[PDB]
Amino acid sequence: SNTQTVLPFTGLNRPSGVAVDSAGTVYVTDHGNNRVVKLASNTQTVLPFTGLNTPSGVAVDSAGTVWVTDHGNNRVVKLAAGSNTQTVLPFTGLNRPSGVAVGTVYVTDHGNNRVVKLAAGSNTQTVLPFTGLNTPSGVAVDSAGTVWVTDHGNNRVVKLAASNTQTVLPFTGLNRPSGVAVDSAGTVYVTDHGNNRVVKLATQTVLPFTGLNTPSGVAVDSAGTVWVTDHGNNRVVKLAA
């Protein structure tokens, strides 16, 4: 499709993260309203998270568990499907965390220029051996265990195989990039926030979104639909394959 669809979310303010599950349910972090909203339906629902302050990244697994980076409280919180009690994950030492990806949980520890991993079960926390990161933003993980990070401060996207080798992806002309997503083909999508555009790397291509204003989050589903949080315009837009 060359024509986007604006999702029927209401009341968003400065939305940040976005995630999509296999059923096609869309979750958005409504940063300015300290809440997470979801759309299955033309009417959204607010998830029963509590005490969020300027939340940022969101992720969802196949069980429908939702993870949110509670940026302003330096923690990560999760809600299982159908539950009213949120769980604070045993991360330690976080400093203004940004993105989150998933039973292993990966978090961009923005303020500490590092990506942290929480091992499932053992809850051992380790720092992934990325190097030279500066104010990193989005994170994504694939089935192979490869981790992609938007190195926002350095205008690049870098990946690490499940390794002491990090690869700079050949994006070009990025300007304060934010979110990153990866589909089953290995196509990587980045929200080039400072340039009001979304780029993918199959050859770099600008997706044909119209009227974007400082886009933040990006998500892609198994059918290749791409969802973007158009932060500057308080809206969420999608492009079908």
Interior angle at CA 36, CA 178 and CA 186, nearest 5: 40
Which experimental technique did the depositors report for determining this structure? X-ray
Cα separation, 133 vs 156, whole angstroms: 9
Number of structural domains in the chain = 1
Place of tokens 């980076």: 69
Largest CA distance in the chain: 46
Identity of the amino acid at 163: S
Cβ atoms 165, 159 nearer than 8 A? no
How many Cα atoms sit within 13 Å of 38 on the Cβ side? 22
Show the tokens assigned to 130.
């990325």
Write a three-state SS string for 83-119: CCCCEECCCCCCCCCCCEECCCEEEEEHHHCEEEEEC
Look at the alpha carbons of 94, 99, 102, 106 in this order and tell me if their dihedral is positive or negative: negative
The arrangement of strands across the sheet holding 5-6 comes to: 5-6, 235-239, 226-230, 218-220
Angle (CA) 116-122-123 rounded to 5° is 35
* Resolution number, Å: 1.6
Rounded-to-10 torsion of CA 160, 239, 26, 39: 170
- Give the whole-angstrom CA distance, residue 158 versus residue 198: 17
Residue 216 near residue 229, CB atoms below 8 Å: yes
Task: Tell me which residue range forms the domain holding 10.
Answer: 5-239
End-to-end CA distance of the chain: 6
Query: Token pair for residue 150?
Result: 């938007």
Rg of the chain on CA atoms, in Å: 16
CATH code assigned at 25:
2.120.10.30
Are 209 and 197 a contacting pair, CB within 8 Å?
yes
Nearest partner of 148 among 175, 194, 187, judged by Cα: 187
